[PDB]
Amino acid sequence: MRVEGAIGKTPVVRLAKVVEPDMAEVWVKLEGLNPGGSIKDRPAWYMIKDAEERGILRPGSGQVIVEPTSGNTGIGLAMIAASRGYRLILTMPAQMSEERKRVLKAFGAELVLTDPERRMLAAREEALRLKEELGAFMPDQFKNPANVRAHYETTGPELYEALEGRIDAFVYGSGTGGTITGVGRYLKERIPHVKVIAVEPARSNVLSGGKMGQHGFQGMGPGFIPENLDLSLLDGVIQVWEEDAFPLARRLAREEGLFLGMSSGGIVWAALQVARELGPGKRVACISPDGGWKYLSTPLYA
């Protein structure tokens, strides 16, 4: 078996200290326990596997893959490209942290640093230029249906099975939209009453009808509505503040032994609010995108 085969089948834990008696149960699926360190291992593998199935790629070919990202998707893609023999090029703003750059380069990914003032725009443009110039494959994480399918076929079934089909609400901090759409659809097809609640930063609350903005929940809240997000599935949207989520993330670590990432703090905070609304006999399920290992130099744990 290769590393791609080590992706998935992550555990789900029930919170016991940060919750209160008047709350529904709160379960958290730990996606940080993936070989790539995050939930992105799933869509990264699925988008590449889907490309191989469609004949766009053939493993061990040295074919070029390009994607504008330096986040978890970049790490997941780098891991898979290293394992399956593809040349990966990732575009990203020049202001990227040395830490992240080191992880990506460790996997052999080639990095192209773009205009720091043009943020994501310059990164997207360079990726498109390379795709055109090299005839490369671009996963296109925000609109590739294979992203959603990864969660519809693995993440969803796993969560459903682990919780024995008993879930009253599913809460998630949306990024590409793949997870909430894939898991949400899978759950709603089986649980008539289940509620699917999206979580987004109050500082970049576009799903709530607000405006995009800079925020600290790395990995979620892209500032736009991605094609992979099926709004028709949503039963609500909860806005979260770092001021509330970071202290909670620290409590999770000190009280539950759960050392999670920045987005996890926001997601769990939201899950607690939903748990209080539903009450004692209910069950709220949510997912922790990644662990705290990559954020020791951030205000979350610094």
Ligand X SMILES: CC(C)CCC(=O)O
224 binds, among a copy of itself, ligand PLP, ligand X, none (CB under 5 to 8 A by kind): none
Give the shortest CB-1-to-a copy of itself separation in angstroms: 5
Where do we find the tokens 């053939």?
A: 58
Give the shortest CB-68-to-ligand PLP separation in angstroms: 14
Half-sphere exposure of 177 (CA within 13 A, CB side): 20
Residues 15-54 vs ligand PLP: string with x where CB under 6 A?
-----------------------xxx--------------
Q: Which of 204, 263, 264, 288 is catalytic?
A: 263
Contact assessment for residue 278 and residue 248, using Cβ atoms and an 8 Å cutoff: no
- Judged by beta carbon, residue 37 or residue 156, the one nearer a copy of itself is 37
Can you point out the beta strands (E) in 69-127?
87-93, 110-114
- Cα separation, 260 vs 295, in Å, equals 9
29 is catalytic: no
Other CB atoms within 10 Å distance of the CB of residue 99: 11
Query: Rounded to the nearest 10 degrees, how much is the dihedral formed by the CA atoms of 268, 274, 278, 283?
Result: -30
Q: Is 70 in the site for ligand PLP (CB under 6 A)?
A: no
Greatest CA separation found in the chain? 59
Q: Which of 40, 49, 131, 294 is catalytic?
A: 40
Give the shortest CB-173-to-ligand X separation in angstroms: 9
Where do we find the tokens 């949503």?
A: 234
Give the shortest CB-4-to-ligand PLP separation in angstroms: 18
Residues that bind ligand X (CB under 6 A): 40, 69, 71-74, 175-176, 219-220, 222
40 is catalytic: yes
Q: Which residues are annotated as a binding site for pyridoxal 5'-phosphate?
A: 72, 172, 175-179, 263
